[PDB]
Amino acid sequence: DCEMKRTTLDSPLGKLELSGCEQGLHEIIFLGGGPEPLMQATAWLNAYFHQPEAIEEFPVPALHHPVFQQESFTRQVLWKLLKVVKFGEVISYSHLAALAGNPAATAAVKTALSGNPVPILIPAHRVVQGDLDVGGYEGGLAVKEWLLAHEGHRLGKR
Ligand SMILES: Nc1nc(OCc2ccccc2)c2nc[nH]c2n1
Ligand SMILES: [Zn+2]
């Protein structure tokens, strides 16, 4: 269900395909101006890459993937990560599990993050194993560590 529109965007990480409906952004997928969620999402991601100093000024699009439609711990993981963990910061899986309402549920957090339908925007790349261990990522570490380097973090690697 949902009346789905798709759109594409160039990025330093290659082509990104955004998909959405009138109620919200659904997905940001790696292909390898106004109030519509898909347009707000395009502007946000373009700012992320090209005007990162202004990123907090760009509206975050409404999200309508089915994981955001119903109450769950997975929803809490993604929502709280989005709300709390800012550009240039990281948080540990363990601390994020507690923030989401289930302390110590580190493996459940990892599973939730692997299901994130809107990477970068929901910053799964900012969730690490610990102080000296950048942890895991869908498709391997290079993109995770590139994003952290873009944000100036010690754990990043260009
Ligand atoms: N932080 C983190 N993030 C993951 O995937 C996020 C992601 C989802 C979709 C596309 C790209 C990246 C993880 N998978 C296992 N451990 C993880 N730890
Ligand atoms: Zn929808």
Secondary structure of residue 133 in the 3-state scheme: strand
Examine the domain organization and report whether 50 and 81 are in the same domain: no
φ, ψ of residue 13 to 5 degrees: the values are -100, 15
Out of 64, 94, 117, pick the residue that ends a domain.
Answer: 64
Closest to 67 in 3D by CA, of 129, 16, 111, 18: 111
Three-state SS letters, 67-121: HHCCCCHHHHHHHHHHHHCCCCCCEEHHHHHHHCCCCCCHHHHHHHHHCCCCECC
Breaks (C-N over 2.5 A) in the chain follow: 32
Give, using CA atoms, the residue closest to atom 4 of ligand 1: 137
Q: Which residues line ligand 1 (CB under 6 A)?
A: 110, 113-114, 116, 119, 124, 127, 135-139
Examine the domain organization and report whether 82 and 146 are in the same domain: yes
The DSSP code for 124 is G
Helix (H) or strand (E) holding 5: strand 5-9
Ligand closest to Cα of 118 equals 1
The DSSP code for 66 is G
Total domain count for the chain? 2
Domain that includes residue 32, residue range: 3-64
Check: CB of residue 60 under 8 Å from CB of residue 48: no
Helix (H) or strand (E) holding 50: helix 37-50
Check: CB of residue 124 under 8 Å from CB of residue 116: yes
